Ligand binder design. Structure first.
Ligand SMILES: *[C@@H]1O[C@H](CO)[C@@H](O[C@@H]2O[C@H](CO)[C@@H](O[C@@H]3O[C@H](CO[C@H]4O[C@H](CO)[C@@H](O)[C@H](O)[C@@H]4O)[C@@H](O)[C@H](O[C@H]4O[C@H](CO)[C@@H](O)[C@H](O)[C@@H]4O)[C@@H]3O)[C@H](O)[C@H]2NC(C)=O)[C@H](O)[C@H]1NC(C)=O
Ligand SMILES: *[C@@H]1O[C@H](CO)[C@@H](O[C@@H]2O[C@H](CO)[C@@H](O[C@@H]3O[C@H](CO[C@H]4O[C@H](CO)[C@@H](O)[C@H](O)[C@@H]4O)[C@@H](O)[C@H](O[C@H]4O[C@H](CO)[C@@H](O)[C@H](O)[C@@H]4O)[C@@H]3O)[C@H](O)[C@H]2NC(C)=O)[C@H](O)[C@H]1NC(C)=O
Ligand SMILES: *[C@@H]1O[C@H](CO)[C@@H](O[C@@H]2O[C@H](CO)[C@@H](O[C@@H]3O[C@H](CO[C@H]4O[C@H](CO)[C@@H](O)[C@H](O)[C@@H]4O)[C@@H](O)[C@H](O[C@H]4O[C@H](CO)[C@@H](O)[C@H](O)[C@@H]4O)[C@@H]3O)[C@H](O)[C@H]2NC(C)=O)[C@H](O)[C@H]1NC(C)=O
Ligand SMILES: *[C@@H]1O[C@H](CO)[C@@H](O[C@@H]2O[C@H](CO)[C@@H](O[C@@H]3O[C@H](CO[C@H]4O[C@H](CO)[C@@H](O)[C@H](O)[C@@H]4O)[C@@H](O)[C@H](O[C@H]4O[C@H](CO)[C@@H](O)[C@H](O)[C@@H]4O)[C@@H]3O)[C@H](O)[C@H]2NC(C)=O)[C@H](O)[C@H]1NC(C)=O
Ligand SMILES: *[C@@H]1O[C@H](CO)[C@@H](O[C@@H]2O[C@H](CO)[C@@H](O[C@@H]3O[C@H](CO)[C@@H](O)[C@H](O)[C@@H]3O)[C@H](O)[C@H]2NC(C)=O)[C@H](O)[C@H]1NC(C)=O
Ligand SMILES: *[C@@H]1O[C@H](CO)[C@@H](O[C@@H]2O[C@H](CO)[C@@H](O[C@@H]3O[C@H](CO)[C@@H](O)[C@H](O)[C@@H]3O)[C@H](O)[C@H]2NC(C)=O)[C@H](O)[C@H]1NC(C)=O
Ligand SMILES: CCOCc1nc2c(N)nc3ccccc3c2n1CC(C)(C)O
Ligand SMILES: CCOCc1nc2c(N)nc3ccccc3c2n1CC(C)(C)O
Ligand SMILES: *[C@@H]1O[C@H](CO)[C@@H](O)[C@H](O)[C@H]1NC(C)=O
Ligand SMILES: *[C@@H]1O[C@H](CO)[C@@H](O)[C@H](O)[C@H]1NC(C)=O
Ligand SMILES: *[C@@H]1O[C@H](CO)[C@@H](O)[C@H](O)[C@H]1NC(C)=O
Ligand SMILES: *[C@@H]1O[C@H](CO)[C@@H](O)[C@H](O)[C@H]1NC(C)=O
Ligand SMILES: *[C@@H]1O[C@H](CO)[C@@H](O)[C@H](O)[C@H]1NC(C)=O
Ligand SMILES: *[C@@H]1O[C@H](CO)[C@@H](O)[C@H](O)[C@H]1NC(C)=O
Ligand SMILES: *[C@@H]1O[C@H](CO)[C@@H](O)[C@H](O)[C@H]1NC(C)=O
Ligand SMILES: *[C@@H]1O[C@H](CO)[C@@H](O)[C@H](O)[C@H]1NC(C)=O
Lengths: 751, 751
């Protein structure tokens, strides 16, 4: 009754087996008969037939992707016996052709990343229930492939299709006879030079059109890239877009566009996001008669339109930018200019809804920051990666021309207005630096190569910063009053400042941490801190989370030094502590007891520990999570239930533990989750996990243990069938060691 | 006849067994009877008796250090049976007392890092042949320990002792009745406040005296440090040093010295190295009547004498520095001043033999570099770690107050005069920066946070640099003429410049490498290079070694891109190639053949490789070393001898290989060294390593393989005894896997 090899979960009242990554040479027949969704993805299966999926009714979905992993042979009508399948995922299977005789029940089919160069009536036209069809990434780049032949009006018979992606195939022409029902159509990187009037003419329901990468701009492309003759523009008919009144999204990126016809937008009152990236638009950004046509546009991406070899003094913004009323975010990146002036952004200053200006990668030497205060709604000022001074490698399921991640880390932005100066040249903060800025909750100073001693006078122009990123500088903390002018400070990231800390002869002062009443999260990671000056303790009444990882506690806690024994005790509010990567061989008993007793979460993981005193857990009544992972530990206590009543989760994975003590799990009612994976365990005696009282443990991880496959594991196997509420994951990965006959075989298979 | 557990080598015609780190619970009786030196260090041995070392004549030396590893019990006169022992190393054994009844044959004894607080006539006085005696590091710091009692005139009876180290013990007084034969005597950190006239009075042969750490300067000490009352100076008698005419070395460091008596040096015409570190000497460096007493002093270390809280404009050097004629290196570090002026170093400019000035850690903002040209002999200018702008944790066997490593990397210094600007603020190189400098062969620019585009005009003031360290900056290579003004350039280190390289939208230009006729070693490591602009190939006719490690060849060599296929082919002189850490799953065949055919050494190690085409080795007739270590490789060819005649060394360690092919080792006469360690091998068939022709293989590493201990390994065990010229190391670490009975046991032990 324990599901194998498939792990089974419950989602939306429904039933889904996860068989992915299971090294399956063939499709299991042991699948739960109730299963709605079957994921075979990333396996070794080389064959599909009519016997494979039998006995299975409610399956609406099959993921066959990535088989076999590092030549999938499918029989005609192998999938026909199943009338309930909507979604079918065949991606990355090295398929020569579309599989013949697919069920007509298919709403959604994914052929992405295959060898199919021929789209035929036989493979498609008989599926009338097709909603979304993905053919993308079959013929592209320098791959050896045939130009894609698309049989006349093959999609003509699909009256229900709202999504079609042919992107990254060799087409050269938009296929004739496209169904009216089309909503989203992806034509990107199809090598199409010409868009006629009659191509999209009959689609009135299109909400999205992707023409990107046709007549590409190939200079400095990090992919094989072939431009149109002379590197000319795509030729788009004056009337090509006239009958799309419903279009929300238009991706024109990398089309080599020098000038844009404003009459393309005549019929599109609803245009929302316009992607103009990777063209030559500097002239159009200077004048831009096409802007007056976009009153509803929310997002506009003009990024990377730079003229080759040019490094102008100022950016030139058309006054017509005042005509985009609903604009929210504006991306200008790789425009490459020297100096941003107050009067250059004038057209943007009256835009009511524009919260985001992306200026990244412009090589800007200087800005007057009083212009950002003359805007209305700005929540995000993204200046990252500039010169500002003081005073398959491509995911077919992702956007090709930019990253889809947030500009600012959501944790930071949630506090308020955001200013990202990261990856710049400001190595020193002058008294006047931040003057005339808005009220800044979130400030990113990361990677500014800042060597200064912070005296507490630096941020006084913007005292209300909640979240401060100082990461990856070389910071000299010689002053006890540092950063104290920020009274409302909550999150502080000091990570990767190790420059001065690692020099012993200089002075280091951390005392500033006590002065913060609201301080909550503090990152002190990877600072290589082995020594401090006159003050050996970190003390805060507010602080909650402290990440001390990547420092030397092996030195601080050295047996011959009593000075740092209390180092964390002064943090009385602290529920979370990260001691990882400190090279700890052991923790002196006196130093462990001096840990804050408020801790609910403690990570000592990824150290060298050969010893752990479990009796010391008596002093931590609030501790729900203990992370011991990635150590040398040989030793487990049998008395643990006498040591802690509070422990929900215990992670022991990747240790040297060879033996489970008799009465280990007994009488501890708290422990839900136990990670024993990747240990030295040969067997489990009957008396290890037996608990006379009530056992709340719902998860046990045994994978990676050298199990003796003899009759001695009968006690444990029996224990497994006796409790089915304990989930052991990766049951194909719990693998018998000895005897040599049973080596490689799962423990769940035995006489 | 295969030595076990001890590995045996030959040094100085002699015979030494290495038993270290062998997890020995007891002292082996299997030791080769001829053995001169026996190293038991870092083992589990808990006992020593009279039966341990029997049958062994010529042993002159025994290393018992670090036993047991993580309570050594020695019987009275356990070592007496051996009349040939000179050296005895007992270090770090947690010894309560000196072992009683030690042989009188001992010239050298090391008790370092033990619990011995009592030095008695019974343990020592009967050994008259003692030459060097190390008692150091028994009672120190915050360790729980007893003040050291030294029985009256216990060393009085040792007439042959030239070396005594009591350092880091609690003494408070220099022991009375010291033998005349003393040459080197280490009293450091013994808590001695007073040096009387009669302490050292009777030692005329002393070449070395270490008084360091008595009355320590404890501000900002990274160890528990207790000063004398008021933090006063050590009190040294006017006449204390009068009878040492032979003293070469004097370590006074960390004695809290405000002023120095010049009459201490009255009788020392031979003084060579004087260590003054960690005192308050700023006044003495300003006047210093003691300098006129040191005509022969070669090294003078004044480092870390800074006045607390002081940041003066200029350093003040006494005119009396002109009076040290034989001075070679001068260390002034942590003097902490702002500005170095031409006229401040005037007293030093006429010193004929002074090649080295160590200015590190002074927080210097500016220097006029034309003063270094007014010296005579300077080979080393060490400016590292300053503010200059544009335009147990302690090793008992090491120096406690500084690092003993070279200032400049020897490879760099060997080229000529050296200038180390590393760890500074110069973020831009102006045209006039290096003007008025000497002729610089070796230049360290590391860690200057330099973002500039090097145009080839930058170094023209010092064109003759052979070795250039640009490591750990953020370098923008946008120019093809970069660095080309250096015609004689040999070694170039570009490591850790990854800042701009990882941005795809910008341009990257490596073309400058071809312009160098003498370029030999090039470090391009950890630059995260996945993309380049207009030039996809590295080309040099001279270049020999290229380290490409820490980049992305997984991206560059992606199957869908032909652009970078030839990337290294243009280097026609290259004998050494490092492809490590490139995340390579596989190398496309066309890309491997495009590797330089001149390669004698190739490292692909520490990648993800699941595949290697051995047939491609046919194209590398010069290749003596192939490094495949740290990969996923499952597959070994049986045909290798047909593939390469040139391969001396093959490193396969840490791979997934489960099987040795029949006829693997056969007919390849070239292979000396084979590393199979840490693989999946269960057994070795008789036909794997059998070679009908002449076999030159002298080294085979099998440790870490899950060996079946059944009778099936008889074929291999037999093969081992049949060839004794093949050295298998770590024979305690070649460990039987199955059956469970033999698990943990070395394969060399079987029925
Ligand atoms: C030209 O410009 C257009 C318009 O911006 C771009 O069109 C977008 O293309 C991307 C890439 O395909 C789309 O992003 C993906 O959307 C998939 C569909 O999600 C929809 O439905 C789900 C629920 O069913 C909703 O949650 C979601 O909001 C959408 O409504 C997602 O399945 C994808 O995510 C999956 O893959 C990614 C990457 O592996 C993972 O991160 C996810 O966890 C998940 O597994 C992905 O989000 C996007 O939907 C398109 N926009 C529109 C409006 O349709 C073109 O890409 C662009 N041209 C190019 C090539 O640059
Ligand atoms: C220096 O140190 C600080 C302090 O730790 C780090 O900042 C924290 O970083 C961790 C990431 O490592 C962040 O934790 C992550 O938070 C996400 C929270 O997302 C929000 O929105 C979701 C809904 O989408 C809500 O559910 C949630 O409540 C939040 O409001 C979580 O999504 C993440 O959890 C997921 O991953 C974790 C394991 O990582 C699993 O346990 C979860 O089940 C789930 O799979 C994770 O919690 C944390 O938010 C950061 N906090 C702060 C203050 O920023 C810095 O990143 C670190 N910097 C450096 C340089 O290392
Ligand atoms: C005050 O100042 C004095 C004078 O400078 C310092 O005295 C030096 O102390 C150090 C530390 O003990 C000595 O360094 C060590 O010397 C040992 C002896 O080497 C001699 O003999 C060998 C061959 O037998 C020669 O090769 C060598 O040149 C010497 O003639 C070495 O054995 C040590 O090296 C071993 O340990 C180190 C560290 O583990 C390893 O790096 C080595 O590989 C090796 O295993 C070490 O080199 C030094 O000899 C002393 N100088 C003199 C002139 O005797 C004091 O240390 C200083 N006071 C303090 C505490 O700061
Ligand atoms: C960027 O890349 C460059 C190029 O590789 C690196 O520079 C090389 O660094 C390696 C060290 O990793 C250096 O190689 C080492 O050289 C030592 C040579 O010492 C000299 O003197 C000895 C006598 O004392 C002579 O025998 C010798 O001929 C030399 O004249 C060797 O001692 C080292 O070998 C020892 O270690 C190696 C393994 O490391 C063993 O194989 C040996 O048997 C022995 O145990 C080693 O050879 C090399 O010298 C450097 N060359 C240059 C040009 O500097 C940079 O370090 C790297 N930088 C960064 C930032 O990573
Ligand atoms: C301040 O600015 C710096 C630099 O721009 C920001 O660092 C960047 O943060 C992003 C988001 O976390 C990182 O990208 C992510 O990396 C992880 C790990 O590989 C990956 O899982 C994610 O999918 C995403 O790719 C990025 O690594 C990092 N960049 C650098 C230079 O390290 C930082 O986030 C900013 N801080 C705040 C609070 O905004
Ligand atoms: C240029 O200046 C930099 C910075 O001072 C030098 O880097 C430093 O080099 C030394 C010598 O190699 C490194 O010390 C060594 O580290 C290794 C690895 O841990 C260790 O095995 C050695 O015993 C020694 O401790 C040191 O790591 C490194 N410092 C930094 C900041 O990384 C560099 O050597 C200089 N280049 C030249 C050519 O002089
Ligand atoms: C030789 C170093 O010992 C102390 C020290 N530590 C620092 C430090 N972390 N930062 C500094 C910044 C500017 C000037 C001096 C210092 C300094 N200093 C120098 C001094 C001004 C005496 O504190
Ligand atoms: C948007 C980036 O695309 C090209 C580029 N790459 C670089 C570069 N690696 N470095 C630069 C330094 C100063 C000014 C401009 C650039 C630059 N630029 C800008 C430009 C002047 C057009 O080359
Ligand atoms: C601005 O956005 C708000 C929603 O936050 C919306 O109510 C308002 O109508 C928008 N104004 C314009 C000009 O689009
Ligand atoms: C910190 O710096 C401020 C301003 O430079 C100064 O007033 C104060 O003395 C410093 N605090 C110290 C040294 O503890
Ligand atoms: C301790 O943390 C809690 C939870 O964040 C917070 O409410 C409280 O203010 C903190 N205590 C102090 C003294 O700030
Ligand atoms: C564990 O900690 C306790 C303190 O409660 C101490 O008595 C005991 O010695 C420690 N155990 C070990 C093995 O150090
Ligand atoms: C300087 O050093 C050389 C050896 O290189 C030596 O011959 C000469 O006598 C020394 N001069 C002085 C003043 O010590
Ligand atoms: C490199 O820089 C020099 C000086 O700035 C300039 O003369 C030359 O044009 C540049 N070379 C290029 C861009 O290839
Ligand atoms: C190739 O390397 C050798 C050995 O260092 C050197 O002698 C020769 O000059 C190099 N060849 C060229 C063309 O510089
Ligand atoms: C190995 O390389 C040779 C070229 O000599 C090629 O013919 C063969 O296909 C390659 N082997 C594999 C398994 O790719």
């Amino acid at each position: 009754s324990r599901s194998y090899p498939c792990d089974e979960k419950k989602q939306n009242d429904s039933v889904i087996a996860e068989c992915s990554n299971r090294r399956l040479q063939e499709v299991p027949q042991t699948v739960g008969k109730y299963v709605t969704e079957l994921d075979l993805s990333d396996n070794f299966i080389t064959h599909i037939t009519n016997e494979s999926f039998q006995g299975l009714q409610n399956l609406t979905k099959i993921n066959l992707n990535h088989n076999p992993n590092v030549g999938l042979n499918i029989t005609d009508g192998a999938f026909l016996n199943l009338k309930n399948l909507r979604e079918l995922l065949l991606e990355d299977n090295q398929l020569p052709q579309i599989p013949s005789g697919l069920p007509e029940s298919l709403t959604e089919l994914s052929l992405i990343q295959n060898n199919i160069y021929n789209i035929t009536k036989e493979g498609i036209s008989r599926l009338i229930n097709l909603k979304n069809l993905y053919l993308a990434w079959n013929c592209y780049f320098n791959k050896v492939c045939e130009k894609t032949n698309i049989e006349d009006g093959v999609f003509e018979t699909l009256t229900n299709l709202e999504l079609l992606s042919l992107s990254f195939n060799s087409l050269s022409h938009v296929p004739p006879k496209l169904p009216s029902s089309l909503r989203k159509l992806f034509l990107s990187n199809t090598q199409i030079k010409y868009i006629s009037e009659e191509d999209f003419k009959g689609l009135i329901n299109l909400t999205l059109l992707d023409l990107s990468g046709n007549c590409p701009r190939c200079f400095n492309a990090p992919f094989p890239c072939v431009p149109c003759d002379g590197g000319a523009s795509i030729n788009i008919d004056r009337f090509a877009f006239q009958n799309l009144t419903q279009l929300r999204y238009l991706n024109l990126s990398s089309t080599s566009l020098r000038k844009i016809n404003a009459a393309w937008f005549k019929n599109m009152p609803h245009l929302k996001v316009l992607d103009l990236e990777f063209n030559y638009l500097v002239g159009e950004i200077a004048s831009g008669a096409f802007l007056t046509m976009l009153p509803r546009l929310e997002i506009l991406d003009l990024s990377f339109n730079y003229i080759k070899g040019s490094y102008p003094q100022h950016i030139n913004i058309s006054r017509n930018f005042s005509k985009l009323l609903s604009l929210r975010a504006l991306h200008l990146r790789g425009y490459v200019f020297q100096e941003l002036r107050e009067d250059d952004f004038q057209p943007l200053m009256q835009l009511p809804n524009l919260s985001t200006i992306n200026l990244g990668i412009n090589f800007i030497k200087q800005i007057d920051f009083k212009l950002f205060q003359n805007f209305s709604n700005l929540e995000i000022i993204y200046l990252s990666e500039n010169r500002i001074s003081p005073l398959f490698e491509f995911d077919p399921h992702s956007n090709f021309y930019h990253f889809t991640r947030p500009l600012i880390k959501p944790q930071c932005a949630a506090y308020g207005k955001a200013l990202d100066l990261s990856l710049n040249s400001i190595f020193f903060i002058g008294p006047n630096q931040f003057e005339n800025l808005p009220d800044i909750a979130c400030l990113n100073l990361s990677a500014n190569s800042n060597a200064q001693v912070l005296s507490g006078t630096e941020f006084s122009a913007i005292p209300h910063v909640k979240y401060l990123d100082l990461t990856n500088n070389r910071l000299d903390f010689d002053n006890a009053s540092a950063l104290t002018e920020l009274s409302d400070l909550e999150v502080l990231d000091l990570s990767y400042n190790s420059h001065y800390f690692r020099i012993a002869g200089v002075t280091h002062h951390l005392e500033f941490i006590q002065n913060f009443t609201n301080l909550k999260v503090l990152n002190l990671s990877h600072n290589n801190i082995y020594t401090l000056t006159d003050k050996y303790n970190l003390e805060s009444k507010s602080l909650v989370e402290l990440v001390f990882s990547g420092n030397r506690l092996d030195i601080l806690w050295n047996d011959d030094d009593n000075r740092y024994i209390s180092i964390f005790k002064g943090l009385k509010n602290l529920t979370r502590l990260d001691l990882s990567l400190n090279r700890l061989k052991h923790i002196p008993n006196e130093a462990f007891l001096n840990l804050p007793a408020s801790l609910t979460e403690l990570h000592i993981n990824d150290n060298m520990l050969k010893f752990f005193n479990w009796t010391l857990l008596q002093q931590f009544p609030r501790l729900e999570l203990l992370d011991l992972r990635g150590n040398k530990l040989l030793f487990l206590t049998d008395s643990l239930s006498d040591f802690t009543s509070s422990l929900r989760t215990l992670l022991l994975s990747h240790n040297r533990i060879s033996h489970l003590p008799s009465g280990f799990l007994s009488e501890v009612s708290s422990l839900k989750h136990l990670d024993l994976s990747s240990n030295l365990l040969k067997t489990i005696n009957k008396s290890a996990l037996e608990t006379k009282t009530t056992t709340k443990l719902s998860m046990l991880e045994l994978h990676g243990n050298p199990f003796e496959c003899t009759c001695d594991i009968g006690d444990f196997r029996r224990w497994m069938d006796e409790h089915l509420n304990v989930k052991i994951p990766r049951l194909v990965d719990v693998i018998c060691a000895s005897p040599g006959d049973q080596r490689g075989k799962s423990i769940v298979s035995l006489e």
